[PDB]
Amino acid sequence: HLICQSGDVLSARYEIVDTLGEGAFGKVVECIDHKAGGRHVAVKIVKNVDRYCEAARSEIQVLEHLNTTDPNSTFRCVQMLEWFEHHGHICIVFELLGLSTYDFIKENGFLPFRLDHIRKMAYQICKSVNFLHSNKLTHTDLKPENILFVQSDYTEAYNKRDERTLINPDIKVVDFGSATYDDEHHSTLVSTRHYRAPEVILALGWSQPCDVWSIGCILIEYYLGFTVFPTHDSKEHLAMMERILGPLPKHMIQKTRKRKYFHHDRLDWDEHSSAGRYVSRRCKPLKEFMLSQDVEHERLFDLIQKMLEYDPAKRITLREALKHPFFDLLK
Ligand SMILES: CC(C)(C)c1ccc(C(=O)Nc2cn3cc(-c4cn[nH]c4)ccc3n2)cn1
């Protein structure tokens, strides 16, 4: 807040007019670009933390590569316009987007998206991340907060109360600070808890399939308006998985160094604990979360179940996901 107040012309070009987001990462601000004719842009002001300078370095590198391969943004990665240093911070300039998909559900009284909208968003997410995968990249940090609408405009109509309906459901993918190349160093802990794959938690090594898991979790949240993994603990997360998807594969449990979670190669979960009772009443088999048994609902959950396959070697690829009957209605 000391160096990012309104009116500030960062690096003698970018007039700050609003702050859009704040956190440990730093801040995202809306700016007028005077040398681009007042066109509004988003500027990520990176915190002076070592971890976030490294992520910033890597996001610049990844997007310079991606925006160069896909300059028209056919595969819906956010465009990076430029980067610089100002007041000792790294600043990354992006095309301005709208509300995140998370923010939208939130601001809509936690109402889920309509299925026709989920199909379009799911297709665009899969296309985007499949493009990354074809370029030897894993995003690792896919979540509703990192899926942003191009335009946040909505119409309002009484339904309970007023419903908000997107004028344009199109999305782009953001935050490439954790994106990792196949041949480069893999961090052990990746993703925000609610969205990390079992192979990540169990430290079994990860690659592109861990993105597929995250998307599976995102689609559930679009369909329900809430997460099915409401936890802040690894072992509890695993227990939630077991209740929703069934027990972990034995071969995965035998291979993990995470012995602390297990006892005799079974999850060491105490069902007489407070956590135990909480998991039992909040979680249930995946198919029980369905709101309808109509064909297209069955198709979404068939796809979701494939995406949430425990074994990453067996998990559906995004290339295969794009061929799923759920997307047929897009033709
Ligand atoms: C409701 C209204 C006032 C109209 C509103 C709300 C939110 C936003 C917004 O949040 N916009 C926004 C955030 N962005 C983040 C990135 C990025 C993060 N990491 N990497 C890249 C890139 C572009 C980008 N645009 C814009 N308007």
Curated annotation (Swiss-Prot):
GO terms for cellular component: nucleus. Belongs to the protein kinase superfamily. CMGC Ser/Thr protein kinase family. Lammer subfamily. It is an enzyme of class 2 (transferase). The active site is at residue 141. Dual specificity kinase acting on both serine/threonine and tyrosine-containing substrates. Phosphorylates serine- and arginine-rich (SR) proteins of the spliceosomal complex and may be a constituent of a network of regulatory mechanisms that enable SR proteins to control RNA splicing. Phosphorylates: SRSF1, SRSF3 and PTPN1. Regulates the alternative splicing of tissue factor (F3) pre-mRNA in endothelial cells. Endothelial cells. The chain holds residues 148 to 481 of 484 of the full protein. Keywords: ATP-binding, Kinase, Nucleotide-binding, Nucleus, Phosphoprotein, Serine/threonine-protein kinase, Transferase, Tyrosine-protein kinase. The gene is CLK1. Residues 14-327 form the Protein kinase domain. Interacts with PPIG and UBL5. Its EC number is 2.7.12.1. This is Dual specificity protein kinase CLK1. One of its GO terms (molecular function) is protein serine/threonine kinase activity. GO terms for biological process: regulation of RNA splicing. ATP binds at residues 20-28, 44. Autophosphorylates on all three types of residues. It is found in: Nucleus. Regulates splicing of its own pre-mRNA according to its kinase activity; increased expression of the catalytically active form influences splicing to generate the catalytically inactive splicing variant lacking the kinase domain. Leucettine L41 inhibits its kinase activity and affects the regulation of alternative splicing mediated by phosphorylation of SR proteins. It catalyses: L-seryl-[protein] + ATP = O-phospho-L-seryl-[protein] + ADP + H(+); L-threonyl-[protein] + ATP = O-phospho-L-threonyl-[protein] + ADP + H(+); L-tyrosyl-[protein] + ATP = O-phospho-L-tyrosyl-[protein] + ADP + H(+).
